[PDB]
Ligand binder design. Structure first.
Ligand code: GL1
Ligand code: MG
Length: 219
C-alpha cells in the first residue's frame, strides 16, 4: 500500500558519519574548540552543514562574520570531499542494493532524505544514481533533523504524501523527523538509542521489501 521509501544516506546506505565527524573535529581543533567528541557528535548526527558548524561555534561561544562562517564551512567540506573520493559500490550496506532493485520492480518510488549536499556525488560513487527517483535538496530545506522538513521534501519530490511513505533511519533525530513528517519509521540500530515505540532491525540486511510490506500492514 505504501507508495514511497525515503532513505537517509548515512547509516542506511553507507557510513558517512565517521568521515563527517573526523572532518568536523579537525576543523574545531584548528580554531581552538576541543569539545567535539563522539558524545557531542550525537547533537551533530544527520544535521546540515550550516547547523552543524553553528553548534560547534556555540560550544565555545565563538562569534564569526558571515564571510568567516562560509570559509569555515568550506574548509571542512574540502576535507570531507577528499575523504570520500574512494567511496565505491563495495561500501553500500548489506541488503540495500537488493531492496532498491525490489522496490523499483514493484513500482515503488525511491527518494533520498539526507541533509548532505554531497548526497548526489555519494550515490554516484556507489553507482546508485539510477535507483533514485528523487533526492531532497538540502539547500531548499530550512530546518535540520529532528525537524520533519527533509522527509516531507523527499516525499513531495517523488509526488507522494509523507503519510503514504516509509522512512529509513539509524539516528534518534532522524526517526523523530520521520514521525513528525507523517511517514512510518523503521529504524536500524538499538531501541535504547532510537526509541521503544518504533519497529527496529539490528542491521540493514533485514531491510527487505517483504519486511517493509509486513510492517506497513501491521500499522
Ligand atoms: O552537506 P554536507 O556537508 O555534505 O553534510 C551535512 O549533512 C550530513 C548528513 O549526513 C552530516 O550531518 C554532515 O556533518 C553535514 O555537514
Ligand atoms: Mg542516518
Amino acid at each position: 500500500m505504501f507508495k514511497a521509501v525515503l532513505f537517509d544516506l548515512d547509516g542506511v546506505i553507507t557510513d558517512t558519519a565517521e568521515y563527517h565527524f573526523r572532518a568536523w573535529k579537525a576543523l574545531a581543533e584548528e580554531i581552538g574548540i576541543n569539545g567535539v567528541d563522539r558524545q557531542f557528535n550525537e547533537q551533530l548526527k544527520g544535521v546540515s552543514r550550516e547547523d552543524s558548524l553553528q553548534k560547534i561555534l556555540d560550544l565555545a561561544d565563538k562569534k564569526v562574520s558571515a564571510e568567516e562562517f562560509k570559509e569555515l564551512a568550506k574548509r571542512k567540506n574540502d576535507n570531507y570531499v577528499k575523504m570520500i573520493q574512494d567511496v565505491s559500490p563495495a561500501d553500500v550496506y548489506p541488503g540495500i542494493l537488493q531492496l532498491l532493485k525490489d522496490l523499483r520492480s514493484n513500482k515503488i518510488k525511491i527518494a533520498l532524505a539526507s541533509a548532505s549536499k554531497n548526497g548526489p556525488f555519494l550515490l554516484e560513487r556507489m553507482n546508485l544514481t539510477g535507483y533514485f527517483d528523487a533526492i531532497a535538496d538540502p539547500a531548499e530545506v530550512a530546518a535540520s533533523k529532528p525537524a520533519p522538513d527533509i522527509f516531507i521534501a523527499a516525499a513531495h519530490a517523488v509526488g507522494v504524501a509523507p503519510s503514504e511513505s516509509i522512512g529509513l533511519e539509524d539516528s534518534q533525530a532522524g526517526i523523530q523527523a520521520i514521525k513528525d513528517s507523517g511517514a512510518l519509521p523503521i529504524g536500524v540500530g538499538r531501541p535504547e538509542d532510537l526509541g521503544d515505540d518504533i519497529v527496529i532491525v539490528p542491521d540493514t540486511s533485514h531491510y527487505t521489501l517483504e519486511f517493509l510490506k509486513e510492517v506497513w500492514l501491521q500499522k
